Amino acid sequence: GNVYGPSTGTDLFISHSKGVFINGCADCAIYCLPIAGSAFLSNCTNCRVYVACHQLRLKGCTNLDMYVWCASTPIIEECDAMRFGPYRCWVGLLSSCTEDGKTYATHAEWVSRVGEIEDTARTEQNYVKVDDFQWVKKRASPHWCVLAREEERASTTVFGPATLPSSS
Q1: Domain locations in the chain?
Q2: Main-chain phi, psi angles of 90, to 5 degrees
Q3: What whole-number distance in Å separates Cα of residue 59 and Cα of residue 44?
Q4: Beta carbons of 86 and 151 less than 8 angstroms apart
Q5: H or E segment at 113?
Q6: CB under 8 Å, gap of 24 or more: what pairs does 59-66 form?
Q7: 87 and 69 in contact (C-beta within 8 Å)?
Q8: Which of 61, 78, 80, 105 has the maximal Cβ count within 10 Å?
Q9: CA–CA separation, 21 vs 42, rounded Å?
Q10: Separation between Cα atoms, residue 166 and residue 168, nearest integer Å
């Protein structure tokens, strides 16, 4: 369970692990190698985040663009101005490597082999459905939406060096 942040204005590189917690980051891009477990973000604002994971939960976040490959539906809580896109927008992952130097040619391979999500076909599109569970009114939640094609930020950024966790 690696803990990262708080941090402002510096791009973060989160290596593969079985769980991450990201607290109090602002005004940056966050590039995560696939996490074979849950990712929890709290109190983050104005960040662009690229993450693959088994579960994704966000609390107290505002103006996050989330590029996500998740085995389950992402959950938000006390969040607003959230926009969701696919992990494949991190084009630079494909020119990156694992800690052991392994490289894969597609995002599905990365997510299957490093993320340990076996059913890549069924999960890729989980980012279009978000569970804003405290919004119990009948109408769609106004707190999140899906990024339009032209608003996708297709990052060519290569991973590394890994950001050192604050704790574990």
Answers
A1: 1-168
A2: -80, 80
A3: 8
A4: no
A5: helix 107-113
A6: 65/147, 65/153, 66/127
A7: yes
A8: 61
A9: 8
A10: 7
